[PDB]
Write a protein that binds this ligand. Sequence first.
Ligand SMILES: NC(=O)c1ccc[n+]([C@@H]2O[C@H](COP(=O)([O-])OP(=O)(O)OC[C@H]3O[C@@H](n4cnc5c(N)ncnc54)[C@H](OP(=O)(O)O)[C@@H]3O)[C@@H](O)[C@H]2O)c1
Ligand SMILES: Cc1oc(CN(C)C(=O)CCc2nc(C3CC3)no2)cc1C(=O)O
Length: 311
Amino acid sequence: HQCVKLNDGHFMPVLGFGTYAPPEVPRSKALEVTKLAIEAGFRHIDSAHLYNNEEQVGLAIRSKIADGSVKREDIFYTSKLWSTFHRPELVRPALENSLKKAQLDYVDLYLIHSPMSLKPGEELSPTDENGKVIFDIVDLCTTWEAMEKCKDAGLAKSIGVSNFNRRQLEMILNKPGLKYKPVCNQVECHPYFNRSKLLDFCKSKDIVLVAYSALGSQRDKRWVDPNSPVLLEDPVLCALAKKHKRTPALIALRYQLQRGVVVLAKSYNEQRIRQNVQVFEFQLTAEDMKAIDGLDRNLHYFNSDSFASHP
Ligand SMILES: NC(=O)c1ccc[n+]([C@@H]2O[C@H](COP(=O)([O-])OP(=O)(O)OC[C@H]3O[C@@H](n4cnc5c(N)ncnc54)[C@H](OP(=O)(O)O)[C@@H]3O)[C@@H](O)[C@H]2O)c1
Ligand SMILES: Cc1oc(CN(C)C(=O)CCc2nc(C3CC3)no2)cc1C(=O)O
């Protein structure tokens, strides 16, 4: 197991547990699998207001504190500001609401979930008469200032962003009077979309890149074309899993660790959850890393359609 030091001095475990499940999955499952993830050795847990599970993820964390398995300081908990709450006066109340649902006094990391802003309101996915998502226009530098106040208040130990491109990161990094840089940029990253350019940019600014859909996404029918390639069926990943006596998923997770990327892995299955912690047990060679680097195909499992159809 291991951690990376963030640019604000805090530490982030390099393997994180992804908690999103689609709305057809009962919320009782998020509670159960987050306990399993902690039992298996995960200490970084990634949630969000969008996921409609912070109450269950927080109950799981509290349960594993109460049974003496971990202390609160051993757990790195992430939440995210949803895009209906970008207007600066909504940022601290959104964080306080997440804290009240999770029954936590602070989050380890609070992220701007997306640079695209949506109409303020109670709906996650506000839509007009024609079924189109209603966007909003917000100066994200003001959103960032409100996030910095949340860190100064102690409600978030660290603050960062998600789904930002280089230009959007530069807008923050170049803001006059910037007090805290983002510690991370959590973005889609896997061998079919390896983000090498953004990764080199983030390294030059001491910003950690955190990979999501590192196992190729849940292929949710709302947004993923069934005809897109299945990452875990890739022949290179399969050959490398055979060389190492591992699985394609483990190859995909270890790839990110060796290139300096913090990696998330969602699983709601006890055996796969426990399997993913084995990413610390083996190593890819430089040749194996070059082969995986050759898989890049600019394939995005997440695009603009992923803002719609959240009930
Ligand atoms: N906008 C954002 O910031 C953003 C976007 C997307 C995701 N995320 C975060 O990143 C997390 C992970 O991304 P993701 O939800 O797209 O899923 P993922 O980590 O790419 O995983 C995809 C699927 O892999 C399967 N899996 C896991 N371990 C496996 C193993 N050892 N062997 C075979 N299959 C395995 C899981 O199925 P089973 O459950 O059946 O095991 C999972 O549904 C999310 O849950 C969320 O926390 C953030
Ligand atoms: C279940 C779920 O859905 C989402 C979708 N969102 C809000 C994103 O920002 C994804 C990336 C994205 N890029 C774009 C540009 C329009 C091309 N549109 O969307 C995140 C999660 C999660 O697990 O966090």
